[PDB]
Structures are given as C-alpha cells and as structure tokens.
Amino acid sequence: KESYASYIYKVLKQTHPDTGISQKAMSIMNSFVNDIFERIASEASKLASYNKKSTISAREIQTAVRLILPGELSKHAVSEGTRAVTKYTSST
C-alpha cells in the first residue's frame, strides 16, 4: 500500500531538521496531497475535454493550477512548476 508518507518526512527534514511528526498528521498530510492531486487532475481532464484535446500536457496542468490555487499560491506554484519543467527539459 503506497503513500506519500516517506516523501513528506524527507520534505519536513529538508525544511525543519529537528521536528518529528505524528502518525495522525502523516495521514492528514497524505490525504491532503491526494485530495489536491485529484482536484488538479480532474480539472485538467475537464479542461482538455472542453477543447477537444486528447492529451494532458504542461499547459493544462498550469491552467488547472491557476484555477484551483488562490492568487498568491497559484503564482508561486506556477513559478515553481515552470522552474522544474525547465530544469527537466535542460537536463534531458
């Protein structure tokens, strides 16, 4: 049974390398990550369906992020996403 739990622990130690996290908080974080993933994926799928497209690419994910996330969070998530995509494209 896969979960985000180990990755959340790594991010937490990367941010604050002296605090632990309870199991209930781990379950809450995993559920929050799954919920956000589901919302973004469903929005991107509907968006690609409206425009008669048959593929999910970076642009639809960017537009879905701009749709769900509030303005400051949307701007920062878009900036980080475009940074990661540029890094991956340069590295390939």
């Binding site: 604050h16 002296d18 908080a25 929050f32 690609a48 369906s49 970076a58 980080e80 475009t82």
Partner: protein, 106 residues
C-alpha cells in the same frame, strides 16, 4: 541503471509514481512528459508550505512534534489555505480560540 526522474527535475516527490497515477486514473488517452513533473512540483510546494506553517505553529506552542492541532492552527490562521481548504474537516483539529466581544465581561 540510471537516475530517478525526481533527481532529474530536482524534486523530492516521486515523478514516476505520479505519472503512473495519471495513466491509471482515467483522465485522458495520453499524458504529456512535463505534466507529471509540473504536478509533482506543485504538490511538493503545497506540502512544503503546510509543513512550514505547521512547524512554526509547533515552535510557538514550544512543542517539537507536529500534531493535528498544529495543522488546524496553520490552515485556519492563513487566509489563502483557508480559502483552499474551507470545506475540509481535520480530525482531532479542534477549533480556533475565538470568543465574541459582547460575551466578555463589562
């Protein structure tokens, strides 16, 4: 053997696992190459933000272990994440300590 796609993108969350979930989730007939990377980066940013605010809340309460109460404080104290998670209930989260002004003595 070769490097994980998270290391190529420079992220901690698994790009390949998100790609598998996108393929198996019945969202579209095709999935672009950069879509899982973008989604992984966004998820990692949101997780990092929540954990930063939860860690700050735990340090304020002089605790060294993040518990659901600190998640509730972090989410309900920030306006952006309260808009994002306004319809979300957190188990064992409690409520914000808010008392109406007229109920106070005098």
């Amino acid at each position: 053997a070769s490097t994980s796609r998270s290391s190529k993108a420079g992220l901690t969350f698994p790009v390949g696992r998100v790609h598998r979930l996108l393929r198996r989730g019945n969202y579209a007939q095709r999935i672009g190459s950069g879509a899982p990377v973008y989604l992984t980066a966004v998820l990692e940013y949101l997780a990092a933000e929540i954990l930063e605010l939860a860690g700050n809340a735990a340090r304020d309460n002089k605790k060294s272990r993040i518990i659901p109460r600190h998640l509730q404080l972090a989410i309900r104290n920030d306006e952006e994440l309260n808009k994002l998670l306004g319809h979300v209930t957190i188990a064992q989260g409690g409520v914000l300590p808010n008392i109406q002004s007229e109920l106070l003595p005098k």
